[PDB]
């Protein structure tokens, strides 16, 4: 399935001048050092995650640091990410900073949780360290970016623990003696993230790498007509397709799901079933060995008739917010709490985060104020509590809320932006606002007030993907075919 | 240049060996002047003019091998008492006389095999010298 498919995370490394000076000002040494670290992290990820981290590019500042460098991991991470947004433009799934400034914190590297495949969130910062040390830090940070984090609630409950009890696991504080195995909850979080639609940009094979043309490296690069890998593992997959980076008499493929038994599969086959309603099934082009590019519902499309919205391919509901923030057993409360707590109250219902004078929420809409769920546990899966978890009690409901934080300034305790409040009514700056606030673009439509001429759904690339037997770009002409 | 074909070098060791610093090692000098790895000090455990002497300060062209050595390029089989050259038709012909055979052999610069082949065998008996002159 989609999980079993080989993910390809396009990573680019940004390097500051501190470790450049520490490496005797040598460009080539830093380049090969980054290549070795990338290879080591890929070897880590290949055992379980089945994900190859392709070092698409790397930048090292031989001159000096462009922006302010501080020992605070959060401030330095923000500066690196804003520098990436301002200057870095090349397509890359993850943008990771090797921080020469060794952070004065207790955590090795600072990476956003579930932030991969994002312009302002796709990557993290890894501090200076030993080759293995920063390789482990990069592995932890990339696990963070793909939503793989140590589960605090399961740690307290003992639901899942590190099977490498010798020296702990990678997700925890980086001990000197590195382990070799990830926990099963790491992989479970990976399936949950991929099924949610996150990390959809990791399914592309780059054609250009920092590595010279190497036969059997697992990627069809420049100068290689086909690549089935080393013949040791080529027997299982693509045995007759490609041999020694060369075709076997009459052939059309090397690997890939869209090409079964080294031959082209029939047209219309689904090489990737949609994970949810936010995902769009991918069909092979009929002449491309690799599966179709990942396409999801455009940002603003609802998971259901009214409730829920797909952002970046990930569904968002109040119930989904409670599940991500608090836990699976925790579900969003009814409108009763929303209209009985957000209207007036301290620490119970608040629109904006103001400890002194809490922001009042109007009765027109109360679905963007304090996030209220049902049966909130002792501790959330991720984040921290700003004080104590708020608890509030003809129908009786167990009403609860909190102020779950994160490594970013954004507060997960409130309702995340874009959560629906009604018809085209979704959160923006802790308030229900229409689509005009977000200024969502209109896809290729021919009628009035429709999407892709009514029948058809626009993908994430703002391009229409018409339905069956609709070859027109704007879903206007019918072309029967067999 | 034996270290050619290598990249991303950090350090090398060259201890416990009595290298004789000579033309074969000249490039090492150049190499030691070009590479910027973390290789420690290296000594010429070699010629008496360089007793355990560092190659970093030591130069290569000081004992460079000059290319001037009279190589045996051809071996004709016949006796030769007097040799001469003369530019006839802008060709530097050579007259290797022969004292015993009694024949005045001619030679010319063959442009195709880069050799010297027969050109003319002037007759006579027990010659000594064949001086060729070019008058107008």
Curated annotation (Swiss-Prot), chain A:
Domain (Peptidase M12B): residue spans on this chain: 7-206
Domain of life according to the entry: Eukaryota
Extracellular compartment residues: 1-482
Positions of the Disintegrin domain: 212-299
Tissue: Highly expressed in the brain and in some high-grade but not low-grade gliomas. Detected slightly or not at all in other tissues.
Disulfide bonds: 117-201, 160-185, 162-169, 215-245, 226-242, 228-234, 241-262, 253-259, 258-284, 271-291, 278-310, 303-315, 322-373, 337-399, 351-361, 368-427, 421-432, 443-458, 452-464, 466-475
The entry's keywords: Cell adhesion, Cell membrane, Cell projection, Cleavage on pair of basic residues, Disease variant, Disulfide bond, EGF-like domain, Epilepsy, Glycoprotein, Membrane, Phosphoprotein, Receptor, Signal, Transmembrane, Transmembrane helix
Residues in EGF-like domain copies: 439-476
GO cellular component, one term: axon
Membrane topology annotation: Single-pass type I membrane protein
Keyword Hydrolase: no
Glycosylated residues (UniProt): 287, 398, 439
Alphabetized GO MF terms: integrin binding; metalloendopeptidase activity
Post-translational modifications reported in the UniProt record: The precursor is cleaved by a furin endopeptidase.
Localization per Swiss-Prot or TrEMBL: Cell membrane; Cell projection, Axon
Any Gene Ontology biological process: proteolysis
Protein's job: Probable ligand for integrin in the brain. This is a non catalytic metalloprotease-like protein. Involved in regulation of cell adhesion and spreading and in inhibition of cell proliferation. Neuronal receptor for LGI1.
Complex and partners: Interacts with LGI1. Interacts with DLG4/PSD95. Also binds LGI4. Interacts with KCNA2 and DLG2. Interacts with ADAM11. Interacts (via C-terminus) with YWHAB/14-3-3 beta. Interacts (via C-terminus) with YWHAZ/14-3-3 zeta.
Involvement in disease: Developmental and epileptic encephalopathy 61: A form of epileptic encephalopathy, a heterogeneous group of severe early-onset epilepsies characterized by refractory seizures, neurodevelopmental impairment, and poor prognosis. Development is normal prior to seizure onset, after which cognitive and motor delays become apparent. DEE61 is an autosomal recessive condition characterized by onset of seizures in infancy.
Protein name: Disintegrin and metalloproteinase domain-containing protein 22
Organism: Homo sapiens (Human)
Lineage of the species this protein comes from: Eukaryota, Metazoa, Chordata, Craniata, Vertebrata
Gene name of the encoded protein: ADAM22
Full-sequence range covered: 233 to 718 of 906
Swiss-Prot record, chain B:
Annotated glycosylation sites: 36, 121
Portion of the full-length sequence here: 157 to 292 of 557
Chain's role: Regulates voltage-gated potassium channels assembled from KCNA1, KCNA4 and KCNAB1. It slows down channel inactivation by precluding channel closure mediated by the KCNAB1 subunit. Ligand for ADAM22 that positively regulates synaptic transmission mediated by AMPA-type glutamate receptors. Plays a role in suppressing the production of MMP1/3 through the phosphatidylinositol 3-kinase/ERK pathway. May play a role in the control of neuroblastoma cell survival.
Consequence of changing residue 76 to P: In ETL1; loss of protein secretion
Disorder named in the UniProt entry: Epilepsy, familial temporal lobe, 1: A focal form of epilepsy characterized by recurrent seizures that arise from foci within the temporal lobe. Seizures are usually accompanied by sensory symptoms, most often auditory in nature.
Subcellular locations according to the entry: Secreted; Synapse; Cytoplasm
Expression tissues: Predominantly expressed in neural tissues, especially in brain. Expression is reduced in low-grade brain tumors and significantly reduced or absent in malignant gliomas.
Domain LRRCT: 17-67
Inducing stimuli: Down-regulated in neuroblastoma cells.
Quaternary structure and partners: Oligomer. Interacts with KCNA1 within a complex containing KCNA1, KCNA4 and KCNAB1. Part of a complex containing ADAM22, DLG4/PSD95 and CACNG2/Stargazin. Can bind to ADAM11 and ADAM23.
High-level lineage: Eukaryota, Metazoa, Chordata, Craniata, Vertebrata
PTM annotation, UniProt: Glycosylated.
EAR repeat residue intervals: 69-111
Name of the featured protein: Leucine-rich glioma-inactivated protein 1
């Amino acid at each position: 399935n989609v999980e079993e498919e080989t993910k390809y995370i396009e990573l680019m490394i940004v390097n500051d001048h501190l470790m450049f000076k520490k490496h005797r000002l040598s460009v080539v040494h830093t380049n090969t050092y980054a290549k070795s670290v990338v290879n080591m992290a890929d070897l880590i990820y290949k055992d379980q995650l089945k994900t190859r981290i392709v070092l698409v590019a790397m930048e090292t500042w031989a001159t000096d640091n462009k922006f302010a460098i501080s020992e605070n991991p959060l401030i330095t991470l923000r500066e690196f990410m804003k520098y990436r947004r301002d200057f870095i433009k090349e397509k890359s799934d993850a943008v990771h900073l090797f921080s020469g400034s060794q952070f004065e914190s207790s955590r090795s590297g600072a990476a956003y949780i579930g932030g991969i495949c994002s312009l302002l969130k796709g990557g993290g910062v890894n501090e200076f360290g030993k080759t293995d040390l920063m390789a482990v830090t990069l592995a932890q940070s990339l696990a963070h970016n793909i939503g793989i984090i140590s589960d605090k609630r399961k740690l307290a409950s003992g639901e899942c623990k590190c099977e490498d009890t010798w020296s702990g696991c990678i997700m925890g504080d980086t001990g000197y003696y590195l382990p070799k195995k990830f926990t099963q909850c790491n992989i479970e979080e990976y399936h949950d993230f991929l099924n949610s639609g996150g990390g959809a940009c990791l399914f592309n094979k780059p054609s250009k790498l920092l590595d010279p043309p190497e036969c059997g490296n697992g990627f069809i690069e420049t100068g290689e007509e086909c690549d089935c890998g080393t013949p040791a593992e080529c027997v299982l997959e693509g045995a007759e397709c490609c041999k020694k980076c060369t075709l076997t008499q009459d052939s059309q493929c090397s690997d890939g799901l869209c090409c079964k038994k080294c031959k082209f599969q029939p047209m219309g086959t689904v090489c990737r079933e949609a994970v949810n309603d936010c995902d769009i099934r991918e069909t092979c082009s009929g002449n491309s060995s690799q599966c179709a590019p990942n396409i999801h519902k455009m940002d603003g499309y609802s998971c259901d008739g009214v409730q829920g919205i797909c952002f970046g391919g990930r569904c968002k509901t109040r119930d989904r917010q409670c599940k991500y923030i608090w836990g699976q057993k925790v579900t969003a409360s009814d409108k009763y709490c929303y209209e009985k707590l957000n209207i007036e109250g301290t620490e119970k219902g608040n629109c904006g985060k103001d400890k002194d004078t809490w922001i009042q929420c109007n009765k027109r809409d109360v679905l963007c104020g304090y996030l209220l769920c049902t049966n909130i546990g002792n501790i959330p899966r991720l984040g921290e509590l700003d004080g104590e978890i708020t608890s509030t009690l003809g129908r009786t409901l167990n009403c609860s809320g909190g102020h779950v934080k994160l490594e970013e300034d954004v507060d997960l305790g409130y309702v995340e932006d874009g959560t629906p409040c009604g018809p085209q009514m979704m959160c923006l700056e802790h308030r229900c606002l229409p689509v005009a606030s977000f200024n969502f673009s209109t896809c290729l439509s021919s009628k009035e007030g429709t999407i892709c001429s009514g029948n058809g759904v626009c993908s994430n690339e703002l391009k229409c993907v018409c339905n069956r037997h609709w070859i027109g770009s704007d879903c206007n002409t019918y072309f029967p075919h067999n | 240049d034996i270290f050619k074909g290598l990249d991303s070098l950090t350090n090398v060791d060259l201890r416990g060996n009595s290298f004789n610093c000579d033309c074969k090692l000249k490039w090492l000098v150049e190499w030691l002047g070009h590479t910027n790895a973390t290789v420690e000090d290296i000594y010429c455990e070699g010629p008496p003019e360089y007793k355990k002497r560092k190659i970093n300060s030591l130069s290569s062209k000081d004992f460079d091998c000059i290319i001037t050595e009279f190589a045996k390029s051809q071996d004709l089989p016949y006796q030769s008492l007097s040799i001469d050259t003369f530019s006839y038709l802008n060709d530097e012909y050579v007259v290797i006389a022969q004292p015993f055979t009694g024949k005045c052999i001619f030679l010319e610069w063959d442009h195709v095999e880069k050799t010297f082949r027969n050109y003319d065998n002037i007759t006579g008996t027990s010659t000594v010298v064949c001086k060729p002159i070019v008058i107008e």
